[PDB]
Design a protein around this ligand. Structure first.
Ligand code: ZN
Ligand code: ZN
Lengths: 426, 700, 407
């Protein structure tokens, strides 16, 4: 039989550590994380599976998002797992630059108590067997894995896990919208026993045009723009918008960029071309310096800490403010503790050290550039795979209720949406 | 917070609001757990009567979400952790009604695992005083924990078990709670169901390892026949919880001074448990000195013998032979656990006095040779171990770790030669996995430093190791070039001054391959090659203009790990006093602090401030501090974007006219708490929960 | 019946009387007994001083030849045209084109300059064919596609290389030669299941070597010596292991950053061979190659028997300095017997056999999935290997040189 326990994320986004037991093999299907929490709740509970080396055949990391790989250098080298971790080739490279940024958020969020070091990040990356797409990898004599093209971010794969004839495919964070970037998800008729989807957009070009219109409006009336991004997340998607629209209507006003852990978008684009073009089966954007934002006139800057975590982004956002021509675009969730949640929640009086209330009079806009499958795409992936049962391990339970109702209504299949720790049996 | 608290108490139960954030609620619970320690909880509940209104609405309104229900239950438990607040929370029958039928236990929201795991935590927060014991006993609040012991959620079951343990261990401080609990435990240890037996063993394990007192002795005496009757069941029920119970009973000698039948329960258990669980129990028995040596010898002879079906079948009972030959899975598991348990038992003082060091090294070398070929079979058992265990990555990792940890035991040089002659064969094997190569490099490194001059016959191992090291530095995978550079770094840190490590390393082409890796595509292989060629050039084995290549990597490189590694290399070049950074002390720090200052990285700037610390410790002159740092980069760094970089500057300046105006200690007190402190505060949390401006959780 | 021939396991002339032939392969292991082509003693080995003759399998009624590969083809004109044979040959065009390439380059190799006690047969070793016989034999080939019926004799797609197919014959008799589960189009093993007699002539000639590990062990000590200032000589074919070598050598250039070294490739049919896939093709050694010699180059010569081709020049030239290196990637020829007429060699001899064919683990897996009524194999694939004490013979008759078994 197949017993699946969502160890951290079965009915919430964050701490994705779904665990699958098939005929004799236990596999860990992510090692998620949670921003917000700062003490041992940021990570999944690894006390419900005890040694791990002798017990866990595989660890599988879907994509490079920090809620699917955040605990991986903690689970491997603090908890004590010595085995194979299976990331697609792009994910293995983006992940040690995404996770060396959480170590910075945590280092200054004073939350480095039970936490992974940089050396531990390198050691966890050295335990990775990076697979290619559509390649069947043998981990035992009878258990094999096979990555697919999910089309969500640069490195998203839909891993199939199979012993004999019984199998389960974890489609962690796919997409079904072919846009001006990474395309849609493809899975063939594996026809497995279980399909462990994601359900973030359960009840689900306008953003493409509106992003460029809203930066175009405030670089021509002398205002300035800040986009708070992570290191190699969704910034590289917005860079090609700010080059393609700026071929059309240049205005030749500056566009900066700043990470410190990578180049602007070239190591991303060494991997983007073969991944997007083969594996399905710039002069405008420049560099940024810490003093390069005091220059007057219009400007567009991408900042290093996402979500307005305290860093480059906080300083730049704090410094544009007071000018109503200036503007900031939020493309991400901005968790509770962050300044981003404070400004896209509705507040315009924010506090800092001492009593310095900041009169935020910037324009504030939020265009969610997250590429997940909506309602129709999830059932189209289920139709592609044609499974025997569907599992929902991402998204809120209120929408997952309706997705359960629909995916049980039209497609006559059994859908389970377990909470954290619940074990479902097939 | 206290001004906004009635507003949030109105918001939480308000059905017109959207669902509150389940992180906001748990941070409120953390805040309330923090505040109800230094203040009397009944004083707090008196001064802000909106909280009892929230709890009464929880009793009254039937349509709250699961998050606020769990929040209110755990909040009631947090407040009612004292007796006076318990009776104050019963003036309107809140606590009997919150946790009884009128609360969430008697409605549909009990189906949510969040509400059940909040009910358990509220009870565990309140069950801390005799009034709580009376409330638990009379109203049936222990029968519900008996039911929830077998809940579907592993988070609720493992909390109901520890709630039962806590209720038992506080009632015994035969009371009705402490007697009904152990009546259920005794009934469950005689049950025919594996989950109930597992729950009873998981209660007894905790309550025997937690408290040592006469009533635990009476519990052990009255339950050891029931425990011992589990070993006559086919199959054995809950073998690992059974083993945990035995090793927590036996670790306290106050239960062996009871009826002796503990040591005869262990003695049969080492002979009747399945092959998966004789190992953990045997190791736990050998980890403690309280067991009899008659038991200890049988405990160790059931640990060794998986490594004795190999020694008796290769070098030219069935209870292990049937395990080592059943499948690659069974053989791999048995040998991995055996070598892991011997890794655990190796460095202890509790090990047996005749520790079979030579035979264990022979068995480990034999297992390794079985994995990477050339292990001759002395029988048909050897002929099945040669084909079953060939090309097995996991047993190779376990055997290499064990052979690494056999280094600590002192022995003759024949053991060192026998270990190295298979570690090298694992290194130069074409089929050796990258992880196996990491294990083999670490094991070789452990086995080389344990050879006390670096010893005879070791230089002839260096001249045969380096032609493998060079081929490993050109490996297709970055893991193996990284591992080879780490091995060269950690071997040129120990014998970098030895004659036969400077005569025999430069006689290879390792330094000219450790230099060609500074241009490797992977940032990890550039970083571990910068640290390689700092350790290679700290001892004079460069095989000149390394400083300009390193400064080029610090200036114009397009990654972070190379620049972090380069600033680290200058950090130990200036600590150590390397000739490149000690021929002109001022000019080097000057030309490196412009590279450090303008970075887009925080650990590089932090290493620059560490380098300024090194320069200032070298100096103590003040004109030398008038260069691009030590008074200027620090002043900019005080207002840096990053708290660790800012704190590194404040700690540096604490260690001139502009230095007087800077309030250093207040700056440090600001730069010692979180960067989230203005938003993890109670007031900011209340405002974030009360924010109605608006504009769904997603992926980070 | 199965009138076996050519007791080499991977190169069978298994004349399956019914009268069909199952393959037309040439051993070519005789050529390792002869001096090069730029009885005499050479480092204690006696060598025949003549044209290197070929081990012809020991034909006027075998009307059908089911040729399956292009290493396994090179006996075709010996029995097709010059021997009194009238009939036909079938294959697929990716097999036939790059087989023709190898035969044409072999005629170019030999007619450009026109263990003896343990030799299995010396009275049957004959001189090499000529271009007219090559073209007459390749004119008899009737191209068929994958899974297309031609008794009902159907090829099936296999996973070894480009156009490498393995056949089945219905009444039921199946057949396997040159198959690979790791990869070209993957194996069509579904139709192999229902069978009555099975043949497993095509398996690995080095079963205790992971092919990916050997690709890594090729690239590693290639780069070890081209970073040492020395060349690399890879004796291989224009079509075969060279394409798998190059699709990973480009990846190794990308991954380890080994650039600014010129990859060369010298074969008279190599310009007609590369289209089947920095690699600077040149057509020979005398001409434009002599002016475009960059010193840390990686030349891929034409024949790995180390007597024909341009490789003999490179072993007589480079074979005295340790910086230069040779990497044997071929699972057909001996590392040591092919190096015999040069044995006072300071040049680094390295054996890294990339064989992607079936190791005995997946052989047993395929046999479990198929469940045949009987299985026929070479006698070396029914007993354990003579170099190992493992259990690496398939558990589920046997054949030898001129052995006629009956099923
Ligand atoms: Zn995602
Ligand atoms: Zn996610």
């Amino acid at each position: 039989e197949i017993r699946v326990t969502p160890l951290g994320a079965g009915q919430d986004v964050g701490r994705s550590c779904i665990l699958v037991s098939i005929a004799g093999k236990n596999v860990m299907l992510d090692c998620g994380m949670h921003m917000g929490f700062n003490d041992d709740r940021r990570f999944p509970d690894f006390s419900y599976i005890t040694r791990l080396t002798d017990f866990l055949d595989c660890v599988i990391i879907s994509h490079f998002h920090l809620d699917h790989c955040g605990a991986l250098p903690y689970f491997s080298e603090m908890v004590g797992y010595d085995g194979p971790i299976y990331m697609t080739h792009p994910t293995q490279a983006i992940c040690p630059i995404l996770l060396e940024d959480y170590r910075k958020i945590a280092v200054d969020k004073k939350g480095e108590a039970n936490f992974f070091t940089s050396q531990m990040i390198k050691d966890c990356m050295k335990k990775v067997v990076a697979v290619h797409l559509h390649q069947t990898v043998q981990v035992d004599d009878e258990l094999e894995i096979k990555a697919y093209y999910a089309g969500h971010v640069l490195g998203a794969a839909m891993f199939q896990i199979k012993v004999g004839s019984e199998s389960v495919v974890y489609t962690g964070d796919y997409n079904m919208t072919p846009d001006r970037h990474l395309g849609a998800a493809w899975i063939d008729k594996c026809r497995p026993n279980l399909l462990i989807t994601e359900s973030t957009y359960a009840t689900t070009r306008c953003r493409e045009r509106d992003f460029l219109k809203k930066v175009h409006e405030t670089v021509e009336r002398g205002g300035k723009v800040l986009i708070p991004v992570f290191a190699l997340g969704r910034a590289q998607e917005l860079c090609i918008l700010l080059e393609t629209f700026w071929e059309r209507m240049n205005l030749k006003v500056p566009i900066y960029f700043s990470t410190g852990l990578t180049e602007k978008a070239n190591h991303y684009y060494k991997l983007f071309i073969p991944w997007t073009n083969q594996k399905i089966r710039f002069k405008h954007i420049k560099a940024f310096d810490r003093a390069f934002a005091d220059n007057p006139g219009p400007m567009v800057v991408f900042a290093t800490p996402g979500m307005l975590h305290a860093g480059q982004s906080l300083q730049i956002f704090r410094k544009w403010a007071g000018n109503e021509k200036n503007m900031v675009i939020m493309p991400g969730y901005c968790v509770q503790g962050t300044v981003g949640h404070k400004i896209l929640s509705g507040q315009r009086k924010l506090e800092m050290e001492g009593r310095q209330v900041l009169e935020v009079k910037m324009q504030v806009e939020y265009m969610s550039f997250s590429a997940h499958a909506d309602a129709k795409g999830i059932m189209q992936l289920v139709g592609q795979a044609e499974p025997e049962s569907v599992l929902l391990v991402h998204g809120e339970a209120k929408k997952m209720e309706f997705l359960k109702q629909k995916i049980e209504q039209e497609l006559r299949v059994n859908c389970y949406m377990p909470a954290n720790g619940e074990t479902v049996t097939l | 917070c206290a001004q906004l608290l009635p507003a949030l108490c109105a918001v939480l139960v308000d059905p017109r609001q959207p669902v509150a954030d389940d992180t906001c609620l748990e941070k409120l619970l953390d805040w309330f757990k923090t505040v109800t320690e230094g203040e009397s909880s009944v004083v707090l509940l008196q001064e802000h009567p909106c909280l009892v209104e929230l709890l009464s609405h929880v009793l009254k309104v039937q349509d709250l979400s699961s998050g606020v229900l769990s929040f209110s239950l755990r909040l009631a438990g947090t407040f009612a952790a004292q007796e006076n607040c318990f009776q104050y929370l019963q003036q309107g029958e809140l606590l009997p009604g919150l946790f009884g039928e009128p609360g969430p236990l008697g409605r549909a929201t009990w189906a949510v695992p969040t509400v059940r795991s909040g009910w358990i935590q509220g009870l565990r927060s309140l069950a801390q005083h005799p009034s709580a014991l009376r409330f638990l006993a009379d109203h049936g609040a222990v029968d519900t924990i008996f039911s929830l012991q077998g809940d579907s959620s592993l988070f609720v079951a493992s909390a109901a078990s520890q709630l039962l343990v806590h209720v038992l261990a506080l009632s015994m401080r035969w009371p009705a709670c402490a007697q009904k609990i152990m009546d259920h435990v005794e009934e469950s240890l005689c049950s025919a169901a594996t989950p109930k037996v597992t729950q009873a063993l998981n209660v007894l394990t905790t309550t025997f390892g937690r408290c040592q007192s006469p009533w635990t002795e009476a519990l052990w005496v009255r339950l050891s026949p029931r425990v011992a009757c589990l070993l006559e069941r086919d199959p054995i029920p809950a073998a690992h919880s059974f083993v945990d119970l035995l090793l927590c009973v036996a670790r306290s000698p106050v239960f062996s001074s009871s009826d002796g039948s503990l040591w005869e329960t262990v003695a049969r258990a080492l002979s009747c448990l399945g092959p998966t669980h004789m190992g953990p129990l045997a190791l736990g028995i050998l980890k403690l000195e309280h067991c009899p040596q008659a038991l200890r010898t049988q405990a160790f002879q059931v640990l060794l013998q998986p490594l004795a079906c190999v020694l008796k079948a290769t070098v030219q009972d069935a209870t292990t032979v049937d395990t080592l030959l059943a499948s690659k899975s069974s053989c791999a598991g048995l040998l991995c656990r055996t070598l892991a348990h011997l890794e655990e038992l190796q460095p202890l003082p509790q090990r047996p006095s005749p520790w079979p060091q030579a035979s264990l090294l022979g068995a480990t070398v034999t297992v390794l040779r079985l994995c990477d070929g050339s292990a001759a079979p002395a029988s048909s058992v050897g002929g099945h171990l040669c084909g079953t265990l060939a090309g097995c990555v996991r047993v190779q990792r376990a055997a290499l770790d064990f052979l690494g940890t056999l280094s600590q035991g002192t022995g003759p040089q024949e053991l060192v030669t026998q270990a190295l002659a298979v570690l090298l064969e694992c290194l130069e094997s074409p089929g050796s996995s990258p992880t196996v190569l990491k294990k083999a490099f670490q094991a070789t490194l452990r086995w080389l430093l344990s050879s006390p001059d670096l010893g005879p016959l070791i230089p002839q191992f260096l001249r045969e190791l380096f032609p493998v090291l060079q081929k490993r530095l050109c490996h297709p995978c970055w893991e193996v070039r990284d591992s080879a550079l780490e091995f060269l770094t950690q071997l040129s840190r120990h014998w970098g001054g030895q004659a036969d490590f400077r005569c025999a390393l430069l006689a290879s082409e390792v330094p000219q391959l450790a230099l060609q890796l500074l241009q490797d595509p992977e940032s990890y292989v550039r970083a571990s090659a910068v640290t390689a060629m700092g350790q290679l050039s700290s001892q004079g084995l460069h095989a000149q203009s390394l400083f300009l290549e390193l400064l080029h990597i610090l200036s114009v490189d397009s990654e972070g790990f190379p620049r972090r590694a380069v600033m680290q290399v200058f950090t130990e070049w200036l600590r150590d006093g390397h000739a490149d950074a000690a021929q002109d002390t001022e000019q080097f720090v000057a030309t490196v602090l412009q590279a450090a200052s303008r970075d887009l990285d925080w650990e590089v700037r932090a290493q620059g401030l560490e380098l300024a610390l090194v320069f200032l410790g070298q100096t103590l002159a003040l004109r030398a501090l008038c260069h691009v740092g030590l008074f200027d980069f620090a002043f900019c760094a005080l207002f840096d974007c990053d708290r660790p970089v800012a704190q590194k500057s404040c700690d540096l300046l604490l260690f001139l006219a502009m230095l007087r105006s800077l309030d250093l200690e207040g700056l440090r007190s600001t730069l010692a708490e979180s960067s989230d402190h203005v938003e993890k505060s109670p007031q900011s949390l209340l405002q974030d929960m009360l924010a109605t401006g608006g504009f769904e959780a997603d992926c980070y | 019946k199965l009138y076996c021939l050519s007791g080499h396991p991977t190169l069978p002339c298994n004349v399956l009387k019914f009268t069909i032939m199952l393959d037309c392969g040439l051993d070519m292991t005789s050529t390792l007994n002869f001096l090069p082509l730029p009885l005499k003693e050479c480092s204690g080995h006696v060598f025949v001083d003549s044209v290197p003759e070929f081990c012809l399998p020991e034909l006027s009624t075998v009307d059908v030849i089911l040729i399956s590969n292009y290493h396994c083809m090179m006996a075709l004109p010996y029995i097709t045209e010059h021997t009194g044979f009238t009939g036909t040959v079938y294959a697929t065009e990716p097999t036939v084109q790059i087989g023709r390439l190898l035969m044409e380059e072999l005629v170019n190799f030999i007619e450009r300059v026109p263990p003896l006690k343990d030799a299995v047969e010396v009275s049957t070793w004959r001189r090499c064919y000529t271009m007219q016989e090559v073209n007459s034999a390749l004119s008899k080939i009737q191209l068929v596609g994958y899974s297309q019926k031609i008794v009902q004799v159907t090829p099936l797609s296999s996973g070894y290389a480009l156009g490498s197919s393995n056949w089945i014959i219905q009444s039921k008799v199946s057949y396997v030669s040159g198959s690979s589960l790791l990869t070209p189009q993957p194996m069509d093993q579904a139709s192999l299941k229902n069978s009555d007699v099975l043949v497993l002539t095509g398996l690995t000639q080095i079963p205790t070597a992971n092919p990916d590990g050997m690709v890594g062990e090729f690239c590693s000590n290639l780069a070890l010596t081209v970073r040492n200032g020395g060349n690399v000589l890879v004796p291989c074919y224009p079509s075969g292991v060279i394409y798998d070598l190059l699709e990973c050598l480009y990846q190794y250039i990308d991954s380890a950053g080994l650039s600014s070294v010129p990859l060369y490739f010298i074969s008279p049919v190599a310009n007609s061979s590369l289209e089947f896939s920095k690699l600077k093709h040149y057509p020979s050694i005398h001409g434009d190659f002599s002016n475009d010699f960059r010193q840390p180059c990686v030349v891929f010569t034409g024949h790995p028997s180390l007597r024909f081709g341009d490789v003999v020049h490179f072993m007589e030239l480079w074979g005295k300095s340790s910086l230069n290196t040779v990497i044997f990637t071929e699972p057909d020829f001996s590392y040591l017997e092919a190096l015999a007429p040069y044995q006072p060699l300071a040049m680094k001899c390295i054996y890294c056999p990339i064989d992607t064919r079936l190791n005995f683990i997946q052989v047993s897996k395929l046999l479990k999935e198929v469940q045949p009524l009987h299985v026929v194999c070479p006698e070396q694939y029914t007993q354990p290997p003579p170099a190992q004490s493992h259990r690496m013979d398939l558990m589920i008759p046997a054949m030898s040189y001129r052995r006629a078994e009956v099923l």
